[PDB]
């Protein structure tokens, strides 16, 4: 089971895990994609890819997604972790120019992914393949919203690059704002929509209950990552972690900061339970007797159900994934699955 310091009894009792039926094929298809797109060396794909559990993380989240939608999401999620690793290595090795050029290419490819499917930088070509596929499911209005959100994510990664190269730890509130962008809260929230087959109108997805449920699902996922990834992040000189901000700016000991992060995570769960009632009541209200109302109600219900599924998927991912097993590495500062 889960060690006491990381255990969340409410998740275990009230957020039962779910798994999408396409998971076995999803796992192998993403492994093949990482190999074919040269996002990881063949030996590292064979030794670590399945053990990283990226497809499991998505298959526990976007329940009900069409298989091809889930495949594009899973490829994107694996890509997103490889990009996190590249960013980290560029920082560690002082590759400011390589990072700046990658950042510019990602902004361009995000707006024009088809143009970049055969780019010489394999990380850019793999990004472009996953994004072009994500852009084929819903109207171009959704694509434009995904792009606006991801442009903001890329710039948050750039701010992290500057923080780490200058040895700056953000303040707590600065960190919490930044973390909604580096974790890509609004991208995961956008991806609920192709998974349930419907672009939600602005009036629906901006309803306060939908917005707050979406926010709390992501805050839990990001801050539980902070709690569980703290050991590897301290070992890797990462500065972006709520516990690190608390130690640096509020004078907490390691133990005190861990307890504070845990309490904030636990409160996300019970705040989510309150707002979920309101979001499901809104879903009921959307079912106004019309065909479109039934469609919107069902989509909102499926999306809020997946906001709930994110809690359990993220919880178990952190205990299953090889990504965080720092105690097993020869060099605690260099995870074996990254290209160093
Ligand atoms: N979400 C991507 C990877 C992370 O969660 P990880 O802790 O590096 O796995 P980050 O903290 O960098 O956001
Ligand atoms: Mg990271
Ligand atoms: Mg990161
Ligand atoms: Mg982390």
From Swiss-Prot:
- UniProt keyword terms in alphabetical order: Lyase, Magnesium, Metal-binding
Which pathway does the UniProt entry assign to this protein? Sesquiterpene biosynthesis; epi-isozizaene biosynthesis
Native organism is Streptomyces coelicolor (strain ATCC BAA-471 / A3(2) / M145)
Q: Where is this motif: DDXXD motif?
A: 84-88
Q: Which family does it belong to?
A: Belongs to the terpene synthase family.
The free-text cofactor remark is: Binds 3 Mg(2+) ions per subunit. Can also use Mn(2+) and Fe(3+) but less efficiently, and other divalent cations such as Zn(2+), Fe(2+), Co(2+), Cu(2+) and Ni(2+) are nearly completely inefficient as cofactors.
Name the UniProt record assigns to this protein: Epi-isozizaene synthase
The Gene Ontology terms for molecular function here are: epi-isozizaene synthase activity; metal ion binding; terpene synthase activity
Any idea which positions bind Mg(2+) 2?
Answer: 84, 88
